Amino acid sequence: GETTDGVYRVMTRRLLGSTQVGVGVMQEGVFHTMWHVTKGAALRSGEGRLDPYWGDVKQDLVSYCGPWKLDAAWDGLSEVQLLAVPPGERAKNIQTLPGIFKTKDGDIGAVALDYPAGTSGSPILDKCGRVIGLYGNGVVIKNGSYVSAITQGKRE
């Protein structure tokens, strides 16, 4: 199948038409997405089959064909870009300064950008172009607007 580095839509035909349930990142021949996008299910790429290798419902992350590869981190200071990939619409960079998720276990970057659910798994970038995590898990605030964590996995 296609194993080129870059960002991918995740599609199903199980509903009406073709439907974009999420997004993901191919790097080093591993496919990275959010667990709620695939629920651990196998994926097809041309005739290629991708099988799940690692996942954790709590991190809401899953890798295919290999272990989690993306280790870059938000530095805590600089702006970042959501490389957003909405259903039926062209990949679009949105530059933003992340806020913060304060938790009993520590602080995580957050990105306040509101896109349809099928955008879950779109990657977040530092200025050098490295992926520092995935958009699409997080929370709805007072306003009714949506705020996502910068969700990053651990590399071995």
Partner: peptide, 10 residues
């Protein structure tokens, strides 16, 4: 059955 399509460079 879900499938992937490339959407751009990073």
């Amino acid at each position: 059955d879900m499938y992937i399509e490339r959407a751009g460079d990073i």
